[PDB]
Every structure is written in structure tokens, then in C-alpha cells.
Amino acid sequence: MVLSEGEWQLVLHVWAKVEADVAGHGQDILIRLFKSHPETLEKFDRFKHLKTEAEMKASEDLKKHGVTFLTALGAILKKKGHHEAELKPLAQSHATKHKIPIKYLEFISEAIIHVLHSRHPGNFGADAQGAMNKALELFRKDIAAKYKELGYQG
Numbered sequence: 001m002v003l004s005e006g007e008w009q010l011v012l013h014v015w016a017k018v019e020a021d022v023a024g025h026g027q028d029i030l031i032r033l034f035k036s037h038p039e040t041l042e043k044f045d046r047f048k049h050l051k052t053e054a055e056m057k058a059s060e061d062l063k064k065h066g067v068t069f070l071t072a073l074g075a076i077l078k079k080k081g082h083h084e085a086e087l088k089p090l091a092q093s094h095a096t097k098h099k100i101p102i103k104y105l106e107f108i109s110e111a112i113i114h115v116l117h118s119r120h121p122g123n124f125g126a127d128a129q130g131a132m133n134k135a136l137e138l139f140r141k142d143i144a145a146k147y148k149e150l151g152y153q154g
């Protein structure tokens with residue numbers, strides 16, 4: 001698929017707001033994911049033991065990983081579709097080392113949309129959400145194709 005420049009602009013406009021607080025957004029998104037789909041927490045050997053949201057909020061390791069994750073995602077979005085180089089190392093580690101099924105990429109896509117909608121209602125109207133969803137679907141389609149080449153396709 002291909003996004004129009006207009007759609008990329010909507011995506012990068014709300015992303016510019018997200019970047020004013022990378023650690024906070026990273027925290028919110030990971031917590032939303034873990035509460036909504038607890039099974040995903042089991043994939044993180046470092047956080048697997050967290051029992052409550054309060055424990056999640058206080059975890060320095062969780063916050064640090066939220067930043068690492070958001071920074072990588074931001075770098076991909078800023079490529080506006082020309083992200084092949086960025087996707088390679090990411091697809092290899094998630095398919096072969098971490099073993100993350102495509103299903104889980106859809107779950108985090110929902111968490112991202114939920115948090116942006118909660119925190120940025122004025123910059124995340126229906127058109128902006130549609131553009132963001134399209135951007136994430138593009139990302140998922142490409143990662144899925146790479147998974148297949150790598151011999152996984154979760």
C-alpha cells in the first residue's frame with residue numbers, strides 16, 4: 001500500500017506532539033497493551049513478574065524499554081514508507097529471538113491508537129486516526145512479508 005503525502009502529514013503532526021514526552025507515551029502504551037492483552041507480558045522476561053498497573057508505572061526498566069520502542073517506531077514513521085533498511089534488523093530479532101506473532105503487532109497498534117486518541121483528541125480526529133491506522137497497517141504488512149522471508153510468519 002501507499003499513503004498520500006496528506007496522510008503522512010496527519011501522522012507526523014500528531015507524532016510531533018508525542019515526541020514532546022517520549023517516556024510518558026511509551027509508558028502509557030505498554031501499560032495499555034499489558035492490561036488489554038496480558039498474554040503479551042509473558043514475552044518480556046524482564047517484566048513478566050509485574051502484577052499490577054502500579055508496579056508497571058514504577059518500573060524503570062519498563063519505562064526505558066518504552067522509550068527504546070517508541071524511538072524505533074518514530075524512526076520508521078519518519079521514513080514515510082521508505083523503511084526497508086529499518087525493518088530488516090527489527091523483523092529478524094522479533095521473529096527469531098523474541099518470537100512475536102503478527103497478532104501481537106495488531107494488539108500494540110490498537111494500544112497506540114487508544115493512547116493517541118486519549119491524549120491528543122484535537123490532533124487525532126477521524127481523518128488523523130485513519131491515516132495512523134493506514135501507516136501501522138503498512139508497517140504490519142511489510143513486517144509480515146519479512147517474517148515469511150526469515151522463515152517465521154507468526
Ligand code: HEM
Pocket residue numbers: 040043044045046068069072073089090093094098100104105108
Ligand atoms: C511497532 C512495534 C514494535 C517496535 C518498533 C519494536 C521495537 C523494539 C526494539 C527497538 C527493541 C530493541 C532491540 C531488539 O531486540 O530488536 C525491541 C525489543 C523487544 N520487543 Fe519490540 N517492538 C515492537 C513490537 C513488539 C511487540 C508487539 C512485542 C511483544 C508483544 C515486542 C516484544 C519485544 C521483546 C520481548 C523485546 C526484548 C526485550 C528485552 O530487551 O529483553 N515488540 N522491540
